[PDB]
Design a protein around this motif. Structure first.
Motif, short mmCIF file in Angstrom:
data_model
loop_
_atom_site.label_atom_id
_atom_site.label_comp_id
_atom_site.label_asym_id
_atom_site.label_seq_id
_atom_site.Cartn_x
_atom_site.Cartn_y
_atom_site.Cartn_z
N UNK G 216 0.54 -1.01 -0.16
CA UNK G 216 0.07 0.01 0.30
C UNK G 216 0.89 1.44 -0.36
N UNK G 217 2.11 1.27 0.87
CA UNK G 217 2.29 2.68 0.28
C UNK G 217 3.57 2.65 -0.68
N UNK G 218 4.21 2.42 -1.23
CA UNK G 218 4.16 2.18 -2.10
C UNK G 218 3.14 2.83 -3.65
N UNK G 219 1.83 1.95 -3.59
CA UNK G 219 1.64 2.58 -4.51
C UNK G 219 0.21 3.30 -4.48
N UNK G 220 0.67 3.88 -3.48
CA UNK G 220 -0.29 5.65 -3.17
C UNK G 220 0.55 6.17 -3.06
N UNK G 221 0.39 7.30 -3.60
CA UNK G 221 1.44 8.57 -4.04
C UNK G 221 1.44 9.41 -2.44
N UNK G 222 -0.38 9.40 -1.89
CA UNK G 222 -0.27 9.94 -0.32
C UNK G 222 0.20 9.10 0.49
N UNK G 223 1.09 9.38 1.63
CA UNK G 223 1.33 8.07 2.87
C UNK G 223 0.23 8.47 4.01
N UNK G 224 0.30 9.75 3.80
CA UNK G 224 -0.89 9.63 5.25
C UNK G 224 -1.81 8.62 5.28
N UNK G 227 -1.18 4.87 5.29
CA UNK G 227 -0.99 4.55 6.44
C UNK G 227 -2.00 3.93 7.21
N UNK G 228 -3.19 5.19 7.27
CA UNK G 228 -4.18 5.31 8.01
C UNK G 228 -4.90 3.95 7.71
N UNK G 229 -4.70 3.81 5.82
CA UNK G 229 -5.73 2.78 6.24
C UNK G 229 -5.13 0.86 6.52
N UNK G 230 -4.04 1.49 6.24
CA UNK G 230 -2.96 0.02 6.73
C UNK G 230 -3.98 -0.30 8.33
#
Lengths: 32, 99, 50, 56, 34, 67, 454
Positions: G216-224, G227-230
């Protein structure tokens, strides 16, 4: 009720596992 | 897996229809699924370890029971690891070693 | 290769293809079903159509 | 206690001569016990019934 | 004059089921004795 | 409601009993606690992985054994 | 009465085989190895699929195997054996079943309970085939149904021998206890690191929580946002669920140590000091098992009763079914679904919590008398051992134990309930009861290691 040594129990257990694999393969071949 | 991002398992169909899961990518040598790659890799490591444990078993001053038990594990790991790998390739390429 | 890559927030290309295939292919099977009955039946023996 | 019972037990013991080496040595809530029984039995029966229900 | 094998057709439910199965699209109203 | 008031007196006393039992029982020390924590952690990981791998291997085998 | 039965069953008991006694004590390297072979063979068997599984949609049972354990050879597993053991213990506590103290009578009692478990397996298997859960019995055919029943029956029998061998002393501990612990730990690791990707309607996601975070971290440009989703993804195992689990382990370890030890000495020999330990969780997991069993039993009766007599007021009053009881006493028994719901209906939450603690405590105390672990039984056991307390007469010793044994059992029932309620709200993976079993079994094995190092 016969007293059985531990190692004999191990070999008997393995044979049962082997038989199940044989039955599945035999099922496919008999179908085919 | 990281670069190509394949699914863990794919799907197929027949006349009876419905989505079979697929573990092995048939007919392309350079393609794989996540599950298939790890399963094959583990076999390769196991075969190597089986020799090392067998070598340790040969050391002197080991009890009768310990020596026999260690030997059984060594042969089981080596034989199953090598033999299973051939089956995996045979499914992936039907004509493997066939002439 | 690209036609099966997991696509987060998107639908995988391969998946959509499979779906329509099911619709079209399933219907085609129905044609065989209909012909099978007509030929393989005995109509008058099973004459509930009376 | 009535003294008369001293002689009463004496004659009883005299009878033992015939009953040699065979003389009778002597001379949990009910609600709780029922409660536990259905709980243990019920779990096994209900688990079987539930499995059929879940499949059905 | 139905045959012995045709007793099932005599059934009130059976005739109604046949009417729905084959004659449901008849324009004229169909009445079944009841 | 009479029974509830009668129950209160037993309610308090056994609560007193619990405190005494806590005082008597031995309490694991911090230093020994660390030793247990490592021992459980190592056993937990070692035993768990064996389950993890055997499950992973089986999944391809399932496909071959049954279409 | 029961003894009269035991002689009647005695011809039946003889047939069942028994493991050989270990001739001599086994050295440590050997000691570990015997258990490991048993562990692998059981683990492989659990996943093997069955034969003649049939199945509308072909390949249905194919998809089933790759998910849960449903349909595997070990589906019956340990449940038949444990039920036989618990029922036998209850009867002895009742005294309806009489067991001779002499060794031969006890050995017959062990034979009987093993046989009784075998009977349970046959009945359970037959019911499943009749119910047609696998497939229509007529479709399967007489030959296929008989073979499938044979496969399960042997699976139960083999398990009994493997457990016995561990008890016999070839391998440390008892086989069944280890097996239950193994799957529980396997569940924790699998959720954390499982690489399988499951397709949700919006998008496919990895099952493994740690694997999910990296992807998830790499795929999504918006880290925040990633992070919340995980951390708080409800649909799939969360990162938080693991952190809750680690926290729960720490608490279990600290409390498990708690015990009270009473000085004891051997009468025959001077200078020999031993302590008899009474654990804080003296009852063990038994109270929670009983309380959960009662609630499930009540739920099944209440839901079934509603269908047969929907009209009756009484069935609705105890529970109203929508299956989850929306209202009534059964609804109060049900655990609160979410923290937000608990805030919505505080009275419901309070009633469930108060009932949960009370039920466990009461059951534990009552269980002791039927269990046979009461102070009266403990004192007599010491007498046969020929070991007595130091500084007290034999009769006085019974009173001394009675001071501590009853209080401990009541507190233990409350404590076990408290952990079980705590686990769900935190959301740690696995039942709290399972967590206790893992730590307890592992720690016992550790204790055995200490002597070996010498």
């Amino acid at each position: 009720g016969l007293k059985v040594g531990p190692v004999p129990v191990l070999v008997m257990s393995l044979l049962f596992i082997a038989s199940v694999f044989m039955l599945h393969i035999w099922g496919k071949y008999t179908r085919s | 897996d990281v670069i190509v991002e394949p699914p863990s398992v794919g799907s197929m169909t027949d006349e009876h229809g419905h989505q079979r899961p697929v573990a092995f990518l048939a007919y392309r040598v350079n393609g794989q699924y996540i599950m298939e790659g790890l399963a094959s890799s583990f076999l390769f490591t196991m075969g190597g370890l089986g020799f090392i444990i067998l070598d340790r078993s040969n050391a002197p001053n080991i009890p009768k029971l310990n020596r026999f038990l260690l030997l059984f594990i060594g042969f089981v790991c080596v034989l199953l690891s090598f033999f299973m790998a051939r089956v995996f390739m045979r499914m992936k390429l039907p004509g493997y070693l066939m002439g | 290769r690209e036609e099966e890559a997991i696509q987060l927030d998107g639908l995988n290309a391969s998946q959509i293809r499979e779906l329509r295939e099911k619709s079209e292919k399933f219907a085609f099977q129905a044609e065989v079903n209909r012909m099978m009955k007509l030929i393989i039946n005995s109509l008058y023996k099973n004459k509930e159509i009376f | 206690v009535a003294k008369q019972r001293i002689r009463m037990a004496n004659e009883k013991h005299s009878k033992n001569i015939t009953q040699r080496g065979n003389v009778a040595k002597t001379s949990v809530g009910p609600w709780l016990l029922a409660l536990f029984i259905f709980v243990v039995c019920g779990s096994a029966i209900f688990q079987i019934i539930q499995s059929i229900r879940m499949g059905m | 004059v139905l045959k012995e094998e045709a007793s099932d057709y005599l059934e009130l439910d059976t005739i109604k089921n046949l009417v729905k199965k084959y004659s449901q699209f008849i324009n004229f109203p169909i009445y079944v004795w009841s | 409601m009479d029974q509830v008031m009668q129950f209160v007196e037993p309610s308090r006393q056994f609560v007193k009993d619990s405190i005494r039992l806590v005082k008597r029982c031995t309490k694991p020390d911090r230093k020994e606690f660390q030793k247990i924590a490592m021992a459980t952690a190592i056993g937990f990981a070692i035993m768990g992985f064996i389950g993890f791998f055997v499950k992973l291997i089986h999944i391809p085998i399932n496909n071959i054994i049954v279409g | 009465m029961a003894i009269k039965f035991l002689e009647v069953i005695k011809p039946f008991c003889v047939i069942l085989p028994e493991i050989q006694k270990p001739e001599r004590k086994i050295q440590f390297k050997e000691k570990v190895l015997w258990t490991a072979i048993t562990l692998f063979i059981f683990l492989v068997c659990c996943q093997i699929p069955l034969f003649g599984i049939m199945s509308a949609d072909p390949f249905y049972w194919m998809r089933v195997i790759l998910a849960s354990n449903r349909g595997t050879l070990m589906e019956l597993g340990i449940s038949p054996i444990v039920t036989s053991g618990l029922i036998m213990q209850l009867l002895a506590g009742a005294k309806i079943i009489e067991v001779g103290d002499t060794p031969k009578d006890r050995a017959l009692f062990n034979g009987a309970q093993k046989l009784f478990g075998m009977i349970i397996t046959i009945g359970q298997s037959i019911v499943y085939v009749m119910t047609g859960m696998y497939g229509d019995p007529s479709e399967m055919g007489a030959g296929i149904c008989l073979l499938i029943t044979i496969q399960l029956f042997v699976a139960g029998l083999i398990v009994l021998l493997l457990d016995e061998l561990l008890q016999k002393g070839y391998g440390l501990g008892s086989g069944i206890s280890l097996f239950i612990a193994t799957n529980i730990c396997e569940t924790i690791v699998w959720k954390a690191f499982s690489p399988t990707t499951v397709n949700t309607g919006r998008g496919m996601e990895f099952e493994g929580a740690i694997i999910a975070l990296f992807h998830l971290l790499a795929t999504r440009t918006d880290k925040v946002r990633a992070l919340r989703e995980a951390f708080y993804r409800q649909n799939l195992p969360n990162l938080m669920n693991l952190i809750a689990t680690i926290f729960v382990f720490a608490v279990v370890i600290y409390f498990q140590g708690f015990r009270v030890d009473l000085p004891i000495k051997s009468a025959r020999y001077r200078g020999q000091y031993n302590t008899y330990p009474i654990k804080l969780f003296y009852t063990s997991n038994i109270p929670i098992i009983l309380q959960s069993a009662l609630v499930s039993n009540l739920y099944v009766i209440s839901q079934m009763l509603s269908a047969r007599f929907s009209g009756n007021l009484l069935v609705s009053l105890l529970g109203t079914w929508s299956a989850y009881p929306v209202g009534g006493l059964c609804y109060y028994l049900s655990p609160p679904e979410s923290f937000g719901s608990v805030l919505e209906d505080p009275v419901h939450a309070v009633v469930y919590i108060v009932f949960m603690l009370g039920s466990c405590a009461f059951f534990s105390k009552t269980w002791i008398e039927v269990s046979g672990s009461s102070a009266k039984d403990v004192a007599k056991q010491l007498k046969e051992q020929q070991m007595v307390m130091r500084g007290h007469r034999e009769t006085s010793m019974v009173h001394e134990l009675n001071r501590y044994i009853p209080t401990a059992a009541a507190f233990g029932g409350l404590c076990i309930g408290a952990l079980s309620v705590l686990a769900d709200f935190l959301g740690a993976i696995g039942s709290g009861t399972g967590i206790l079993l893992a730590v307890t079994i592992i720690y016992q094995y550790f204790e055995i290691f200490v002597k070996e190092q010498s």
